[PDB]
Each structure stands twice: as C-alpha cells, then as structure tokens.
Symmetry: C2
Subunit: 325 residues, 2 copies
C-alpha cells in the first residue's frame, strides 16, 4: 500500500563516523551506510558531506524524493530546537553556532529536524528498544563520554539552554576527579571508558593482593570497561572492587534521577552496556539503596536493546512530526 512507500532518514553524526539509515515510518531499518567525519577546517565540511552523502544515495539507487517524509539528525553539542541550531560541539571544531537545519533543509528540499545525539538515542530506545514507548524514560549512554536523554510526560526534555539530559555531568563526588566540563566529581569521570580505568588506577593502591586486572592497570593499559567487568564476572577480586565503586556512583546518580523524575525505566546503553546483566545488576543494587520506597518499587533499571542503531532510529523518529495528518 502507498503508506508503505513512505520513508524517513535518520542521521547519527559522531566525532569519528556519520551513520545514516532509511527506515519505514514504523521505524524498521531498510538501508544503512556511513562516512568518516571530516573535522578539518573548523568542521565546515561536515554538513556538506552529509548533504552529498544523501544526494548520492538517492541518485545511486534512483530513489523517489517524495517518498521521504523527512530527515532527523542527532549531533554532538546542544541544540536549539526552534532555531535548528547547534552550539557546543567543540569535538567537531564548531566553535561558532551552526545553522545546520537551515543548510540541510535548504540543500535537500525535504523537511529536517535535529536534536542532541544522546537525546535522539533516547528516543530510539523508547520507540523500538527497552523504553517500551513509556511516557517517562531516562536514557544514559556510557562510552567515550557519558550522555543521556530524558523523556518525561511524553516529551523529550531540553531545558532553557538545551542541556537537559546531561547526566554525565551530575556531581557524584563533590571532592572527585577533575572533569573537562570544568568542575570535579562528574559521573563521567568515573563511568566513561576512561573513567573506569581512572577509578581502577586509583583503587589499585587499596588492593594489596594481585590479579590479572591490577597488573594490566598498573602497567598503563587502557583496558576496556567490558574487560574490567569480564574480570569481575570471572571472579577477579580487584575487578570486583572497581565495578563496585563504579556502580555505586551510577547507582547514586540514577537513583537521584529516579527520586526526582520517577521514570518507568532508566535505560543503560553505550559500549560499556555490552557487559550485560552483571553491570545492570550492580547498578540496580545501588539504585535500590539510594531511592525512596515509592521509587524503588516502580522505576526499573534496564539495558539498552538496540545497540548502536538507537541513534539512527531515534533520529529518524524526529522526522515523524512532518507526516501528512
């Protein structure tokens, strides 16, 4: 049927790779593709590369432009939704406000929406993943950095400056490690790929025994969070001390999100989450310590179900605001 010919495009713009998908309006992925993110020359090539990659795909496959209901994009930094504008994407070399919506919509002639990259991932997990289309879902992504998205009373939250959802920068330890954001004791300092290592680098001195994990940490290895958790599951007394510390802080931060927002679920995604049930459990355990009874007995600690496709899926969902009603 003619409804089944409609398509939406999602863009997942990351510091290293830009991923695209074409999906049905029900959010089933029809095609995926990617390119490198060119950050050279103050990142002026990024938006043209995205425009070019979409023009070429449409042309390559002789696609019908009017099948497309619209394009949704997730981007690093903070987004003014009304403006279609991106500020704070320093990792991209955008030091100045970027009129991304204007450029793409203009170039492509198909309606465009954009949002922050974890925000859009949050929408993806709500729509097709662990969020289960609940009106109240918090997404937290642990990878290179710590990011998040909040859907509350059915809507994605942005706040006054587009910074709602920034849970990586919740202070879990007023006396903790220096964060790049410019304060100390952010969740991100203790829970990103790099934060877990840092927590392990500093607990090492509190462990008089030896273990395969302690040896590699002490040697200067940047062991993945996955490997750290795997040593823990496998019984490594040092890995178990590090995981314990890490999930304490994730439990405090997610707990206080539960206490304030009471979402149906907090969904944990990103690379670390491959660690699976062993991580979900330890997070849930400290979440339980830190939450009041009504929140304990209602808000659930979940793992992401979509892996790295949540971005393109969530981004795509922003395009649905353009459907003919």
């Amino acid at each position: 049927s003619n409804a089944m010919d409609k398509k939406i495009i999602g863009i997942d713009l990351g510091g290293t790779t830009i991923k695209f998908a074409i999906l049905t309006t029900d959010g089933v992925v029809q095609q995926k593709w990617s390119i490198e993110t060119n950050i050279l020359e103050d990142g002026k090539h990024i938006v043209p590369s995205i425009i070019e990659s979409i023009r070429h795909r449409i042309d390559l496959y002789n696609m019908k432009k009017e099948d497309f209901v619209g394009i949704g994009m997730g981007t690093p930094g903070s987004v003014d939704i009304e403006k279609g504008t991106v500020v704070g994407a320093y990792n991209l070399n955008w030091t100045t406000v970027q009129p991304v919506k204007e450029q793409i919509e203009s170039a492509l002639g198909i309606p465009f929406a954009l949002d922050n990259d974890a925000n859009v991932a949050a929408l993806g997990e709500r729509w097709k993943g662990a969020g289960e289309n609940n009106p109240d879902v918090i997404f937290i992504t642990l990878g290179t950095g710590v990011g998040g998205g909040i859907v509350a009373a059915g809507k994605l939250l942005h706040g006054v400056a587009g910074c709602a959802g920034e849970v990586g920068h919740v202070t879990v330890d007023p006396n903790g490690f220096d964060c790049t954001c410019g304060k100390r004791g952010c969740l991100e300092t203790v829970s990103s790929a790099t934060g877990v290592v840092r927590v392990a680098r500093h607990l090492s001195e509190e462990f008089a025994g030896d273990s395969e994990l302690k040896q590699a940490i002490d040697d200067g290895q940047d062991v993945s969070s996955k490997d750290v958790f795997e040593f823990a599951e496998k019984g490594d007394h040092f890995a178990l001390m590090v995981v314990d510390r890490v999930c304490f802080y994730l439990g405090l931060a997610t707990g206080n999100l539960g206490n304030t927002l009471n979402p149906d679920s907090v969904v944990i995604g990103g690379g670390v989450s491959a660690a699976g049930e062993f991580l979900r459990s330890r997070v849930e355990k400290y979440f339980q310590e830190f939450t009041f009874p009504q929140v304990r007995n209602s808000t659930k600690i979940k793992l992401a179900e979509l892996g790295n496709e949540a971005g393109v899926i969530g981004a795509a969902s922003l395009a649905l605001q353009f459907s003919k009603e």
Copy 2:
C-alpha cells in the same frame, strides 16, 4: 452564559483554612474567598463544606455549571490523581480513602482534578510568580518538610508512580542522617526547619569558639531554624558554619537538578526561604560550584514570589486540562 468566557476554580486545602479562587483561563484573579477547615469526625465534613461554599458562590454570582471549565484542588496527603482520591492527610484526620473527585463531580457536575500541595504551588509560581511562565521551572519548598514540583517542556511531571518532583528525598550525603523514608542523607534531613536544627546540634559539639548559637544549644534552649538563620545574619561565626553546610547540600541538590533538567529557574519557597537573599545567595554560590558552565550561566536561582497565593492559582490551572 458566555461560552467565550468560562472561568476556572482553584481550591487550596490547608489544615486550618480552605482557600478558593475564580480566575479567567488566562489566570487573572476574578474572586477569592476562604472558609475554615473543619477536621472533626475523621475529616468527613471537609468536602461537603467545599461543595456548599462553591454551590453558594455560584448562586450569589448568578453563575451556572456551564460557565466553568473545571475545578482544581491542591491537597495534603497521598494522592491518586487518576481516581481523584486522597489518603494519609493526617492533619485533616483523613485516615481512610477520600473519594474527593466523585464527591465534587457528583454534587456540582463540573469536572475536577486534584494534585499534591507542592505540585500545585509549583504550577502557581511557574505560571504567575518567579517562573514567569517559562516552560521549564522547578519549585522547591522548604519548611516543616522539603517538597517540590517540576514543570518541564510546559507540563507538570508525575513519573510512572506519581513521585516525580520529590526533591526532599534526593540523597545529598550517602553517609548522613537517617531519613523518615528509610534511607540516609536525604536533603529533607538537612534543609527542612527540623533539618537545619539537626545540622546545628551535630556540629556544635566540635566547635569551640564563641557563638551565641552554640551557648544556647548548650544552655538547653529549644533552638529553631529562623534562630540559626538569625544568628548567622548577625555574624555569629558558628551559625554561618551551619548555614554554609545547609547551603552546600541545597547547592548540590539544586545544582544536579540544573545539570539534568536545565530549567530557566529553580524557585525556592516555603518557610525557611524567609531569610530571603541571605539564603538565596549562599544557595546560588554552591549551585555554581556544582553545575557545568552552560547550565551555571543559564539556569537561575530565584525566590518564590507568590507566597501563600501560589497554591490556589496553581490549583486553578489544573482545571485547564478540561478546556474545549
């Protein structure tokens, strides 16, 4: 009978008086009245008195049910919004489930909604007080307990079990005092009228130098929070220490709300907020320490501006759900 000019009713049910207002749908006050709260007989007279007072008023003003979009009520107790019931408002003697929404609609034929005190105070300040009607406003109320409400993307938040906005039970110290709720180090534990005093009586013992605050505690006087704030305002060195502490915790909690929700404002109200700028400015200092720049330099700390009128105006706004 002008359908282009319907009105909303707000009700603020307190333990001693019940406040009413009629507003236009834009929230301009047309009429305010109050009656006392009769709690005798397990609180069984309260909703009939409200109905009577509203019926009578409707009759005075030659109004009819069709001139009203709805009625909203703020109440203490444990509320189920969907059902429209209340339970556990012990200052009301409401120890059994009160079918408030049934009583109201079945007597008045005007649609009714209800919510908790704090939430409705939040709606008020967001709409007509310090929130300036911005879509993202967090209100927190300091007093005998710590309570709150959050408006985000223009909607009050309730969460899946109706607990959203419960700021007083955010963990500010993983190893702090025992909270009534069952866990340690809840904000309520340090920043309620009772919490402030708790902090004073727990630091005095280490402090040695001279302060009128410390001598009074050590005389055996029943020190209050307005008293602690009093003494610090006069320069009492130990009392400033206790305020610093309370504000550190308040900074952290509001700071983290700032980091997760980035509202245009965090509005601080209730009894402890009587200290005014003396309070606000210390809270803002720790809020700044605990936020990252983009939030630090957008979300504002503000004092509540409506005082005791926030409740009735925010309760009126519940009625707007029934428009058209």
